[model samples]
Target: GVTPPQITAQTYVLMDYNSGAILTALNPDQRQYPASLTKMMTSYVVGVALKQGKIHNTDMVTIGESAWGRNFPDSSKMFLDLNTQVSVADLNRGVIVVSGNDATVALAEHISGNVPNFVETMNKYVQQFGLKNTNFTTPHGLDDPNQYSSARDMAIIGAHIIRDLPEEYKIYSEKDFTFNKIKQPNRNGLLWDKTINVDGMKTGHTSQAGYNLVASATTSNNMRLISVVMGVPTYKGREVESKKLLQWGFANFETFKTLEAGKEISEQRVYYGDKNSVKLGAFMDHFITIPKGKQSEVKARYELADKNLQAPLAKGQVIGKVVYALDGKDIASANLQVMNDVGE
Candidate 1:
């Protein structure tokens, strides 16, 4: 049995990005200030809005008085000039690559008409993500008693950032961003480490939040992992802990595909249909992360909710569930759907 490495972070979580399975954690659900890691959610909301056409990448936004970079002189910034025009794409990069508090506020105002309204959208995403421990009081993640999140919640947000906004996800891989003739390197130091494929996520720190980070990386086999470390004592501590957590996840656990879309898991007898049987399979690919040597121990079985699956079946109708268990304990599952239509 491989034991997870011990760390001193106040709270942390290491999980398989594809399965959202918690490989290890300590106080994962406990609420802690997100610090600049709040920018992850800030960027996610803007990315989704852009995808929905509520905003465009190249849309020029005039800097407002509230979003001036100097307003947050004490914090990290993208150094936006008031009354100057910048594109949403640049602002997006500014937020992800540079952890720009100013750029974050500017985009929030542009997207939701005000910081309060934009934060409302942030909380809405929290609700949408089904995160109960997170709330956003500001777009740039300044320390507010009302603004807090958990390691597990941040991991979920990290996964969404990668899965939902892939094009924007690339920005996290950037090491630095130059805007307005001012260049700032990304706050996440692991991006510079060559030993691991650490690409992205975000970093945070404050007297209250200590030092925090949410990081993502891919293995040589292309499996992704998300790790969160919060309330560390020093900048290096957060980076070191994050790297340790990610490396531990990759070394010990491997993501395996137990169910894949378009592949039939079973051919079940159908009644009163144009065909004698229907192909049943997963509508979405299902993945599970277990200890490296335990791959052979992972087991799967599809339970047909409708034992006598009738015809008039639609292409994506769910008839049962495919469950995966490890050592007799259920680990993961996905909906079993009809692979093809069987007309009556």
Candidate 2:
């Protein structure tokens, strides 16, 4: 069922983190200025670097001449002086907590040898993530026309960051941190609200980009959701709109189980294997989100081949398809897989 929702922003998306289901959307693919939300991708790439041992928190990097020359006195900064030596940890904190543009440039230069190369890496990652309406011209998103991303793409990146880098994501939850004896509180106000369960994520703002926010939260029931809003009119309005979107998402949607791992859902005949056939089941739990009263209205249908699978079928090989329908329309589908080893 569809329900009307009012959104003040030009673009928005409400997605279920667990099932990758689009609960609701409005111009989700529209390219809009991401502002600081660009840092989410930066942080994710840095998280990968940290995991690969390319860098460490205590690693020291000198602020380069380019970084200094690019700094404007009035710009949002980490207060890093030109030619100052800073730790990778501090740079990460500055970007995550304060949305520091200078910090972003410094980190980019330190990691990729130059900002241009880093921007190239960022663009490469856009394709790696299967993002369509996204491009990165600068790591800090300094108002280049080519540097734009969609609400859907940001949500996709947010999900990847949470899923792939749990430890690094913790940096986003920090309410305040001291860098070079200067204390700065996180710009994300939701962190202070105990009821929000707001963990790690990024926020962005620019005169051209307006105010943008990409936030994720996990409920007590283990349901996670990522919400993205772009072109919001004001900084305060972005926060308020994000909170409302999250509140509506939690209230209107609920998840129900569709399939469980290791449980055989069907059997497929074998062609060349030692065994005559093999059992097929879901490798992971399958779930879906729906309106509060519509779980009973959902339907499931399975499609499988008439012949048994050929021998040497590897575990987790898709052997069939399961379609989930709601209101007489298909809503989701999962490929059935062989859970056990099949050999010749």
Candidate 3:
């Protein structure tokens, strides 16, 4: 917890991806243009549709005139031809790797019957995520004064993508993709950087937005960090600062799993059920982020609601919470669950 490095980004956030903890934040809530970064949400909506059974990966999307005609020259693209059919699987890859405005529009248009309708669906997730600083006017993060998202909001969106659509999220890790006989390398520069553990992400740039990067890296210890940089001077600058923050985060902050998900932590007294005591564990991995020298300073304790006898308990039943503290101050917690079912 010494002095952190001075970051050049106008708005940025370094966060623990798995634990939903902020390691360092700078103007994290400030409004900023997302440019092509908007595709992340566009792709997220697509993933949701896939999971909802509204669309199938094998479905062929016809490149509509609306999607074909609109092309923003500010960034990379997937050369989708009008009237030609492409698979949903390829379209998803196009959005992530090529950051294709056309591909974004095509996917959005197909998913919701039109871009406007698709945008409505996108905003629903924005509100659903409680991102007050974010709004979407276009599918591809095109230039619109009303469309903007904060660094913090985007980071959460990225985290949600990884959590909710883990299988679909792997598209971001692809280095390049080819569609309609043209190949495009992913714009995220960190994927090419070797000094850090960079992986999947989105990149954006525009005359109005400058160079922006939304990237994540996993440390050797299996701790994943999300780094967002908005309005850096250039693409290279964004990548350099992104790495600096990641290295600092992995070096300075240490992440530990207080309670491994599905692993027994302790036993809880059962209520008027078949068993006297029930095994308890976290439904998901419980983690806490602390400074390097502050590992021992972190503490955990069980907090149960009632001591009296209860009744039947189901597997994954939330009976209490595992409270985490640092320096005697409550920092985080997770729902404690019964490891197995009990008779009535």
Among all candidates shown, the one with the greatest lDDT: 1
Q: How do all models score by TM-score? A: 0.93, 0.91, 0.88
RMSD, every candidate, angstroms = 2.0, 2.4, 2.8
lDDT (10s digit) by residue, model 1, range 177-228: 9999998888788988999999888988879858899899998788999989
Writing each residue's lDDT as its tens digit, candidate 3 over 1-344 gives: 56777999888999998778899889999999999889999989999999999999999888767667345454566877777888989888888888877888888878998889999999999989999999999988877899999899999999999889988888888888877777778877788777787887888876775889998899777889999999899888998999888989988988887888789878777767888988888777777888877877778887776664377778988877788888878878878888989888
Q: Which stretches of candidate 3 lie over 4 Å from their true place?
A: 69-75, 262-264, 268-279, 293-297, 305-320, 326-329, 337-344
lDDT of 2 by residue, 98-125 (tens): 7778888889989999888988878777
| Model 2 global lDDT (CA atoms, 0 to 1) | 0.82
Clashing pairs in 1: none
- Give the top-scoring candidate (TM-score): 1
Deviation in Å, model 3, residue 241 alpha carbon:
0.8
In order, what lDDT does every prediction score?
0.89, 0.82, 0.85
What TM-score does prediction 3 earn? 0.88
What overall lDDT, based on C-alpha atoms, would model 1 receive against the true structure? 0.89
